[PDB]
């Protein structure tokens, strides 16, 4: 659905079947609600417990087609420019892509061979560093996040006696805003996420209906003005 279809069809649902019976939303407000709705839909359909089916990213064909146009593969760049301090002796700091939303697969190409990266929690790190050897298994590497400035920096703790030659990251790209008009034309300097012009949906058409319905629900709740409605539909913001 083009942006013009998202605006026209919001009023067949929010505005009492385009009857001007409900309050009436500007195009900036519709754009804001659509952007928030798409963020909510992505977050809910990612986590299995966030949706109504109990199914996550790759738990059904529908979920696979939902995130199909967000999945991106990018390389990490060595953060040798800044001589920071790492928590681990053998940690090579790598910076991740800027348009990163959620990581789902990471791999590192060493001289010994490719090794799947395990994002290791702060408890497992303390548990595995209390042992004699203190290295990953032969076919894996660890990863912990470190001091990050306006980006995402990750320490790659690969086994000693090995050098990192590559670092591939497969992640969900940050969705672009949904904007139904040139905001600068009538609204002075309002931006949704830094873009003031018409922005289409960068998602598969399968979830456009989901996003529009969530936007309509959010609009109706924000206008009913009840605290109860706001807190109830705020549950699904995550």
């Amino acid at each position: 659905m083009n942006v013009n279809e998202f605006s026209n069809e919001f009023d067949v649902l929010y505005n009492n079947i385009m009857s001007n019976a409900a309050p009436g939303l500007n195009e900036y407000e519709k754009s804001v609600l659509l952007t928030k709705a798409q963020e909510e839909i992505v977050k809910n359909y990612f986590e299995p417990a966030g949706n109504k089916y109990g199914k996550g990213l790759d738990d059904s064909p529908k979920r696979q087609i939902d995130f199909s146009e967000l999945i991106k593969v990018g390389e990490g760049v060595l953060n040798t420019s800044a001589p920071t301090i790492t928590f681990d002796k053998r940690a090579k700091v790598y910076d991740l892509p800027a348009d990163l939303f959620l990581v789902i697969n990471e791999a590192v190409d060493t001289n010994a061979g490719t090794k799947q990266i395990v994002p290791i929690s702060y408890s497992d790190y303390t548990r595995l560093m209390s042992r004699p050897y203190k290295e990953p298994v032969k076919y894996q590497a660890w990863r912990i996040i470190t001091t990050s400035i306006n980006n995402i920096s990750v320490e790659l703790i690969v086994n000693s006696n090995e050098t990192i030659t590559d670092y591939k990251v497969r992640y969900i790209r940050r969705p672009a805003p949904i904007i139904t008009t040139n905001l600068s034309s009538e609204y002075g300097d309002v931006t949704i996420n830094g873009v003031s012009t018409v922005s289409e949906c960068e998602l598969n058409p399968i979830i456009h209906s989901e996003i529009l319905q969530r936007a309509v629900e959010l609009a109706k709740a924000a206008y009913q003005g009840d605290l109860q409605a706001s807190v109830e539909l705020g549950q699904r913001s995550e």
Binding site: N20, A21, A22, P23, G24
Partner: protein
């Protein structure tokens, strides 16, 4: 004059309530109606529709 209402302006006699609607002396004049909307006036309201 008899059973009809007349007016005199600019040197001509204009029969009243006989021309086309909203046409006074050959010129179109607008019509409007203003009404204050104060229901539960202590309360602050968002006027919507």
């Amino acid at each position: 004059v008899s059973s009809e209402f007349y007016a005199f302006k600019d040197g001509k006699m204009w029969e009243q309530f006989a021309g086309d609607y909203n046409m006074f002396f050959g010129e179109y004049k607008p019509f409007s109606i203003t009404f204050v909307a104060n229901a539960e006036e202590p309360n602050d309201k968002i006027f919507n529709t």
